[PDB]
Symmetry: C4
Amino acid sequence: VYQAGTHEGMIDFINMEDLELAATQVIPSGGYGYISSGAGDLFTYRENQKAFNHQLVIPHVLKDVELPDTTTYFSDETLAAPIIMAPVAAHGLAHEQAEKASAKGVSEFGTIYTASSYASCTLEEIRAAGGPEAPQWFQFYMSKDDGINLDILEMAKRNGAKAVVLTADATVGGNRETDRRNGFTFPLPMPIVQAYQSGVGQTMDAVYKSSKQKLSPKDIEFITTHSELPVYVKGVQSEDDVYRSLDAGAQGIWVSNHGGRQLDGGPASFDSLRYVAEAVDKRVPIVFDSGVRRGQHIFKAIASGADLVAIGRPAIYGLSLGGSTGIKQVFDFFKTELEMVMQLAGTQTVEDIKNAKLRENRFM
Amino acid sequence: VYQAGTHEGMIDFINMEDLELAATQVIPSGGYGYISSGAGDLFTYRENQKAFNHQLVIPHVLKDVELPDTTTYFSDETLAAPIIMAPVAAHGLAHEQAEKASAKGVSEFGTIYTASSYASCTLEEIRAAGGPEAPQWFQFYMSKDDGINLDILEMAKRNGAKAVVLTADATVGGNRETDRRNGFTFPLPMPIVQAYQSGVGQTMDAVYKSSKQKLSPKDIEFITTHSELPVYVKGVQSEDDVYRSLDAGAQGIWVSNHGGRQLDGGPASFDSLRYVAEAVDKRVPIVFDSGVRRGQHIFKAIASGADLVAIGRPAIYGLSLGGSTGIKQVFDFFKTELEMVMQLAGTQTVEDIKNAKLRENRFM
Amino acid sequence: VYQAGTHEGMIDFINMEDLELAATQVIPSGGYGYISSGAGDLFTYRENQKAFNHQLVIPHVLKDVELPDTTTYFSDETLAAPIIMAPVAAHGLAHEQAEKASAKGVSEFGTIYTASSYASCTLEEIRAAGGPEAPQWFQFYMSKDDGINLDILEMAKRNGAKAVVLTADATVGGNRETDRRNGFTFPLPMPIVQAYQSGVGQTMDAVYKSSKQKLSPKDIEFITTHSELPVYVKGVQSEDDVYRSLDAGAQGIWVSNHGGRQLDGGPASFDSLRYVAEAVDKRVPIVFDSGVRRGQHIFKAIASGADLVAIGRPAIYGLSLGGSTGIKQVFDFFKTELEMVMQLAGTQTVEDIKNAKLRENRFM
Amino acid sequence: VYQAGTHEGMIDFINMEDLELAATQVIPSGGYGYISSGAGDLFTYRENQKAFNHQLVIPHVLKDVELPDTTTYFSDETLAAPIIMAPVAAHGLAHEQAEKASAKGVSEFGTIYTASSYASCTLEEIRAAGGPEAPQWFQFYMSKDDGINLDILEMAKRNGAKAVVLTADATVGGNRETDRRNGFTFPLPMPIVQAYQSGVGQTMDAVYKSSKQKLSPKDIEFITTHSELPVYVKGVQSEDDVYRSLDAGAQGIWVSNHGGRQLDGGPASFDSLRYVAEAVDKRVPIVFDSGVRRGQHIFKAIASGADLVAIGRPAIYGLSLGGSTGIKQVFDFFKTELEMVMQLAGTQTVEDIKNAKLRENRFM
Ligand SMILES: Cc1cc2c(cc1C)N(C[C@H](O)[C@H](O)[C@H](O)COP(=O)(O)O)c1[nH]c(=O)[nH]c(=O)c1N2
Ligand SMILES: Cc1cc2c(cc1C)N(C[C@H](O)[C@H](O)[C@H](O)COP(=O)(O)O)c1[nH]c(=O)[nH]c(=O)c1N2
Ligand SMILES: Cc1cc2c(cc1C)N(C[C@H](O)[C@H](O)[C@H](O)COP(=O)(O)O)c1[nH]c(=O)[nH]c(=O)c1N2
Ligand SMILES: Cc1cc2c(cc1C)N(C[C@H](O)[C@H](O)[C@H](O)COP(=O)(O)O)c1[nH]c(=O)[nH]c(=O)c1N2
């Protein structure tokens, strides 16, 4: 039997590194390997966190700032901070209460929750746990069957999704050698995609291969036609990918390399953000993720063209140790660090962060 | 008595690093040192594998790709993948069945086998083991005696060689200090070059010095005159070397630094490929080798101007552990990784890989 | 009870690294952690010392130099060397005699002493210990209350401060995780700021938050209006910060990142010095600090536009082990190294150092 | 009593790294520390050997080369190879037979021997040991007394010195902290400089301070006036130093940073060679040293503008273990490696090395 974390309450940590280590005590070895590792030789995975010091934040002085405000106005939403929950599969790997605990905690922090197509819970349970005023987005792993795709989009609409995130950088799984060494298989169902994927006893490789490989601009047009919700393309790391996405009617761009879990030997996401921000030229919102472990990383991403920054692994480690309380403590850690960075950089508001100029590191 | 690997069947490995370590259990210490190490302080040897992350592969999205096809049309050949066997001396160091096992396995995978002048078997045995439809090339370590050179070329013709690979970067042996520490000598004859070299009990240094040092463009003209087979020059790493080769009538260029076994303090082969591809300007085919351990390395070489990528040490480690089955499993490992990279990069066919644009890594 | 160093006399050390290690034997663990560590992941802290080899000193020959002279004419002062004491809080953490021992030792060496607002002693005790001819500057952590600010400035005037150093890069404390792990609190009062801060049992974070966060150019104008002393802005690392400071009437610029204790992910101070020196264009004096551990670091800073270089941690380690004798030995170590560097670089006087041209390191 | 090496005969080594380690068995700890270490934090010392891979040697093919010839015509001399003995103090630290053993071995190899002013033997003994046809140069540490300087120059003339090497980069000693830790003092006299320096029981720092600090172009004119021998300036690493030297009548330039023993935080000598070669523009010969441990290092220096390359520490380690036989084996190691590099680079003669083009390493 697979037994995940069961604690609901305050957790003890200093930073995201000791939090990651502490989670090894409550997540079964195979599940921990699935969450913690990445593709191939882990070049791209390691580069994600290193890349934030490719650009240096200037601690400006005499900027007439106190009590910096992380409050973020995004569409008709008011967020506590420009920090959201990334779509992460199978929260039941981390905590018994799974996406019910994560959706409740992110709702209570007061920011956007992105639900995974590969969730351990139904979208109905995710909406119920967050409450009716919780801002929730739906991340779509599409079927090869358009009937099933219409059914999943109608289901996202019923549950009040405010955007559809088409993940386009996992048409097949990466060469995740920790999963291979562990003989990893999923312990729980995936109810949202149950029409094409059963989850239980399936390999990582098998699950991605059950979804659609031949994604194209026609898939954005399909989602627009049948849902009327704004479409974000996730995995965008170049100008060519921006123009393909916007020409097909995308209303958002999500810069990511899937936390270094996919194509080893590719760039760090933070380096790609510069190319993507130039191509987008503020025409649509940008979400950024992959390697974020400090407030200074969030500041640098927003200064470089991100409107929102998404959190993956650190939120899952917090969930494993403390449930809803634990995941909210991780968002609070990032908000508290961002407030410190805003004061020392001289930015009163999130819009002021966007206008900050970083210095390129010539000696990395 | 020298006792190499004897197993014929499926081998257990994750990647080429644990395969290299596993081979230490079946290859005698001196033979393992000869295969595994390189020249001088090993700067050039280490740089070969590191250099693939000097250029970054973009994981494009919405590229309308599924079931990527590695099938490669090269001259009148149909190859399983754009991946061939490099010429490697003395396979009897690795497996009792030597080049009979390696030629059979590479034939069954369905790609080009390059036979070494310093083989443990005759070219007749190599042709017999591969079968009459197996695509085979002949790698030439020339004699100082032109009579012997005519005899060896007529022998290559009789055995249906489709190209002659003139190896030009080993006129003398490098300073291979592992061979010195081990007191390495060859345990087996070298029948192809028996007219000038006996093999048994000879040092690495002695064998290279028995071949021709004063290679020049006149040697390409000699091979053309007497064989009528296309000549590839192997070891080409600069524009000057391309023009010398093509002006003398070469019909192919093989970019290599001999797996870091020759001139320590020289460039990584993958970095040299850019200079060579610019000079060749698609006038003749390019083969690339040295440091290839992943599908992403093959993808990057082809995107950078290679038509074919050759495998050395990893194929020999597979041979040592599993014979024909083992060497085919190594080619299958590279083909399976290349299919994963093609799907995540957005390339349907090998010609699409050639049109991919890599991003230079400004933070190596 | 908190028990610091008590020795007054000569100490045994080779360089500042073994001095830092030796101090662990006499400074209580919590105090040692407070002095020795820095912010976040310590990127900026480590980069400070590494950055001095971003620029290379040319050992010129035949320069007609002997007995190089470090004597420095600064305003109406004659200093032994262009090397001064940085403002460092709470010397009682290091030695029982606290700022009485440090002010006496720096006076006897013959250079500027910068008194911290967060001193363990009164400014009256600091002036008494240095003697009436000792050059002393006052470092200001401002109150939120302008009445208290007028009182502190009148107090600096009474004690013969020759400049006011407005520290502007610590409006809040950095994420100093060693202090968090140690549960660090200050053991002694802070008499200079007693009107707003009691010191005893207070966290690092609490003390900075008791001072003024909303520093602006109006604060320079306030100090000028009420003290008539030259104002230096400390923490300046960019052109924008120079122009803000000078436009508000600053008569000096102090380039610093607070010894890597504040905004992790910011530049090394030595790299920032180039940008600041270009903007200042010799209009006002420049003080430089953060990471100085060798004479070559002082030489490089002065060649790059610094008029004076300030010493922090190394002076405190010397104080802990030897009191007034020990801190003077640290200044003597830096002066002796600077004399060696001046002879080998070919600079007879400090003005000659300013005219030296460094070579940028293209291979860091 | 100080007891150095006593063996005369063949020594067992692979490369200069295991030779350096083996010498620890025969050189007393204090002497070994004096020979093996360098200044300050050893940045410049470590950079010397690393810097050779800042520029990459192209292994050219089809260059029509065999039996490469290292024979070097320099002035009226015929050298075995473009490889000479650097001036190194006090060979009695390494071997009982001191400079008698080193001069005999270098004479028998057939190249230039540079005698140190701080030799353990007289120049008469050095000339007698080398024989009358041995090419010998005299390295000058000048006195503050011009009478003593005239006496030393007349002595160099009597002993048939063919050049005077004015060492200009050691006007004072570097901060050699191994010597400090060891309490190092010289065990033997320095007969050449006995008029101003006794040697026995003296520190490194004291010996350099007894020589002339205020070296200037007037000192080149003095040597020319009183000896009529060509003057080389040693320690030249910039254009300014070339023009100062040539304007004063120098007939040679010796590029060096004194093996990283002097100004820590300065450039690697191999990097400085490019700047010096451009300024000299073949107007006078260039000697190069500091960090040479391989044939590829000698090749790269000559391709970059050096006419001769000098050997320091490796020659002293060979001397300690094998006397005249041992030091000749070290020169033979370098000649044998240079022959291998010349064959693989495609250079028939030393003049061909000068015309080789290196590729700058963009990924160091
Ligand atoms: C365990 C786990 C599982 C998933 C993911 C990640 C991880 C760690 N990610 C990728 C995710 O959205 C995000 O891009 C990364 O997690 C960001 O990198 P960091 O984890 O913050 O370093 C992911 N993305 C997505 O679109 N759908 C999914 O179902 C998942 N599943
Ligand atoms: C044990 C061994 C033996 C040989 C070689 C290599 C090795 C490892 N190589 C060089 C070979 O063709 C190829 O360039 C390298 O092996 C490529 O580097 P990797 O081994 O893939 O890293 C080689 N090349 C050649 O032209 N003729 C030969 O006989 C040999 N022999
Ligand atoms: C223990 C301690 C305490 C303080 C400081 C530093 C340290 C180490 N610093 C910063 C100081 O002035 C200086 O910028 C740095 O010390 C310089 O870096 P190094 O210590 O030389 O590496 C500091 N600066 C300031 O303006 N007022 C203060 O009260 C203090 N307090
Ligand atoms: C033990 C020892 C002693 C000396 C030296 C070096 C060493 C190691 N060197 C410097 C020498 O000429 C040369 O520049 C360096 O040795 C070159 O660096 P490598 O030793 O080859 O790395 C030196 N130079 C000089 O001009 N006169 C001298 O008396 C000495 N003495």
